[PDB]
């Protein structure tokens, strides 16, 4: 009865949106940066190497002071490193050894991790006694966790494989708000610098922009072909870059609501695992499944260098706050710190 | 270096000494992955060899420590987390014999014994489990005996072409699950007809694990 006309109205609305999107597209960004001096050549060498994980490494996160580090492996261990001296500060054992995410609080007091048990655990690093202990366990997801980010010392946002994202309240342990609209597993998160919006990439080959305070979707971006594995925000806060399994990375713009450029090659056939930017936004580092890591000119799409030092595939990648170093993790159980 | 960094170095040395000590305690264990489809009898299997997300079980038989991970309560995409389990000693598969006469609930044009075959075909031929053996369990055999007299096996496969007896049907069913393996040069499949049996269920697993370990040791010399 009314289903057919509802479908027709939805199709015409989508056509109208695409028509407006095409009409507002004046010219490509490549023409503008035609007369821009290229970066040249980028050379980086391994300055530090950290060992101690007897298993695959799945995630890492940099501290807010650009000195401390957190890593999580499927051996059931959470290690806090001191990057300057390659020292060990803490070693936390997990109840379940199937962990696939970790995070570091901006204040430096808390650390969170989650995995295949559908539970996010929060640890306290500054107890009165000389040990760490679980402070709160959050439950309510019906699927494995994928990402974890700290808004502040009392708020946290998680994404799981049940096609939902939620905003928690650590003190009470209850979900303040829930986000719906994805038709596939959600695999990544990225908090805006203003800490007012965030983006998520799902397995249905799409990305969405959420509003933390109103709890509603504002924009959705398409253009990928297979699946989205990583996402990251531009330092300006008006753009983001994604990474997929089709072996392509794309840059999207919020204000124009389109796609600007793509980062593809011909000798690359494996999917992207992680994506990160630079302090100024001139470079874009993306880990790959073929044990290598590439550096792309963000405004020209030219490979500036290669970071090849790992035996197995690269799973995690991060850049310090001040932009003085970049750390890489892999399935060969070694963390390497590179510098320029 | 300055009377406050040597303490950091010794603390880190204690930390990684404890890490190394704890690492080798979990290396002398056998890890098994339990799979199946629906109510094929995983609960009965766990009851025969016993002591939301991932469920874990521990049990010891003859000074071998066993760990079994049940992942039947995920309902998510298997592709995104199946590579976490690469490296397990063996995979346990549970099949219900008394399923040829029954079909799915929400779908009528789908035999319940074909979805199990599809799942076995998908699991056996994977890029991560090329060198991992499979232990196959056919659970409900008494009810199969009860229903085989009146109902024929031709409903599932209209090519059985044999007398409706126990042996000629059970052998055919076992064969139907064994040519789905297209990696005969590197994989082995162990089958066991059991139904509310005794310690026979645990002894078979012990023997299969011993055989797998011996063959793995032999393969390191280029001699097998």
């Amino acid at each position, epitope marked *: 009865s009314e289903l057919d006309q509802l479908r027709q109205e939805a199709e015409q609305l989508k056509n109208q949106i695409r028509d407006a999107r095409k009409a507002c597209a004046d010219a490509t960004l490549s023409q503008i940066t035609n007369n821009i001096d290229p970066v040249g050549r980028i050379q980086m060498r391994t300055r530090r190497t950290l060992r101690g994980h007897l298993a695959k490494i799945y995630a890492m996160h940099w501290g807010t002071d650009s000195r401390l580090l957190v890593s999580a492996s499927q051996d059931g261990k959470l290690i806090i490193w*001191d990057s300057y001296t390659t020292n060990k*500060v803490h070693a936390i054992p997990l109840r379940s050894s199937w962990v696939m995410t970790c995070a570091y609080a901006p204040s430096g007091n808390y650390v969170a991790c989650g995995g295949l048990d559908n539970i996010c655990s929060i640890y306290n690093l500054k107890t009165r*006694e*000389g040990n760490v202990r679980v402070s709160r366990e959050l439950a309510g997801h019906t699927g494995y966790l994928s990402c974890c980010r700290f808004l502040d010392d009392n708020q946290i946002v998680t994404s799981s494989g049940d096609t939902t994202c939620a905003l928690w309240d650590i003190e009470t342990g209850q979900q303040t708000t829930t986000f719906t609209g994805h038709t596939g597993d959600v695999m990544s998160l990225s908090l805006a610098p203003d800490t007012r919006l965030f983006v998520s990439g799902a397995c249905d080959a799409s990305a969405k922009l959420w509003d933390v305070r109103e709890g509603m979707c504002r924009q959705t971006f398409t253009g990928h072909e297979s699946d989205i594995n990583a996402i990251c925000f531009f330092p300006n806060g008006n753009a983001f870059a994604t990474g997929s399994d089709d072996a392509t990375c794309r840059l999207f713009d919020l204000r124009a609501d389109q796609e600007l450029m793509t980062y593809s090659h011909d000798n690359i056939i494996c999917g992207i695992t992680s994506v990160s930017f630079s302090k100024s936004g001139r470079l874009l580092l993306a880990g790959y499944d073929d044990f290598n890591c590439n550096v792309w000119d963000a405004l020209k799409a030219d490979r500036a260098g290669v970071l090849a030092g790992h035996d197995n595939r690269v799973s995690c990648l991060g850049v310090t706050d001040d932009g003085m170093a970049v750390a890489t993790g892999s399935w060969d159980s070694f963390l390497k710190i590179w510098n320029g | *270096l*300055s*009377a406050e960094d040597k303490a*950091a170095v*010794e*603390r880190s040395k204690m930390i990684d000494r404890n890490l190394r000590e704890d690492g080798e305690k979990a290396a002398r264990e056998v890890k098994l992955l339990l799979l199946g489809a629906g109510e094929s009898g995983k609960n009965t299997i766990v009851k025969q060899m016993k002591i939301t997300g991932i469920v874990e079980t521990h049990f010891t038989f003859k000074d071998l420590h066993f760990k079994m991970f049940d992942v039947g309560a995920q309902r998510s995409e298997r592709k995104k987390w199946i590579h976490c389990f690469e490296g397990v000693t063996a995979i346990i598969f549970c099949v219900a014999l008394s399923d040829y006469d029954l079909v799915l609930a929400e779908d009528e044009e789908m035999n319940r014994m074909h979805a199990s075959m599809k799942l076995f075909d998908s699991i056996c031929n994977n890029k991560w489990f090329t060198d991992t053996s499979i232990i196959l369990f056919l659970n409900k055999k008494d009810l199969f005996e009860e229903k085989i007299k009146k109902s024929p096996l031709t409903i599932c496969y209209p090519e059985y072409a044999g007398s409706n007896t126990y042996e000629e049907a059970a052998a055919y069913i076992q064969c139907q699950f064994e040519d789905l393996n297209k990696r005969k040069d590197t994989k082995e499949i162990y089958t066991h007809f059991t139904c509310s049996t005794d310690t026979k269920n645990v002894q078979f697993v012990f023997d299969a694990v011993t055989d797998v370990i011996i063959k793995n040791n032999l393969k390191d010399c280029g001699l097998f």
Partner: single-chain antibody, 233 residues
């Protein structure tokens, strides 16, 4: 809920033998190094010995080595100090201090009550400019001290500590590394320094703030304590 219990003491003849005992509870005793600090009557504190976690490092004072030993018991959470070859100059009350060392830790945070011990009858030096300074209520005053050797290291971290002892009470940690405020201390206190001269600044002095202040160094062993400054109204 950190609690400290000590056993042993009393008058004894010179050359006697005994053992000083300590009890710990409410915290992980196996992850903390321990120190022994004594204070003779009408005298300042004096570092005695140090033992690290795992009993891998032991140190003794110049006038203490040879006639003293230290030990710990992890299962019982007990600390020991055997007494032998005693002299008449060892009449002091012995304290127990816990310390943990990693990136960002604050050692010497908790001090024990201590037990009284009495018998029957180079290196960096800490110097305080003034022995006793009068205090005007409701105003702001400062305490300054200097050292013979600079306490600034290559890594950029300096090792200067401030301790306050209330009249008839155990001392507590105020400021560590001359610029960091310990937990549980009000923001009135503020530490400062530059290279070799260090001054402690107080926003306002109250009735509780009266006490005796001490200065410490941790660049190398032994640990030297400056003479306490008597705050008089």
């Amino acid at each position: 809920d950190v609690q400290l219990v000590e056993s042993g003491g009393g008058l004894v003849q010179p050359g006697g033998s005994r053992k000083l005992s300590c009890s710990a509870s409410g915290f992980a005793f196996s992850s903390f190094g321990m120190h022994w600090v004594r204070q003779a009557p009408e005298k300042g504190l004096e570092w005695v010995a140090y033992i690290s976690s795992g009993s891998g490092t032991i140190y003794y004072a110049d006038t203490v080595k040879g006639r003293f030993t230290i030990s710990r018991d992890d299962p019982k959470n007990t600390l020991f100090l055997q007494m032998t070859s005693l002299r008449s100059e060892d009449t002091a009350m012995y304290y127990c201090v816990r310390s943990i060392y990693y990136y960002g830790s604050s050692p010497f945070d908790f001090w024990g009550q201590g037990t009284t011990l009495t018998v029957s009858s180079s290196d960096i030096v800490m110097t305080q400019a003034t022995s006793s300074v009068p205090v005007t209520p409701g105003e702001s005053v400062s305490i300054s001290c200097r050292s013979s050797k600079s306490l600034l290291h290559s890594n950029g971290n300096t090792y200067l500590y401030w301790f306050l002892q209330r009249p008839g009470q155990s001392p507590q940690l105020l400021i560590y590394r001359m610029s960091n405020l310990a937990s549980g201390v009000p923001d009135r206190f503020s530490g400062s320094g530059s290279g070799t001269a260090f001054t402690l600044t107080i926003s306002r002095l109250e009735a509780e703030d009266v006490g005796v202040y001490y200065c410490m160094q941790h660049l190398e062993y032994p640990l030297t304590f400056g003479a306490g400054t008597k705050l008089e109204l």
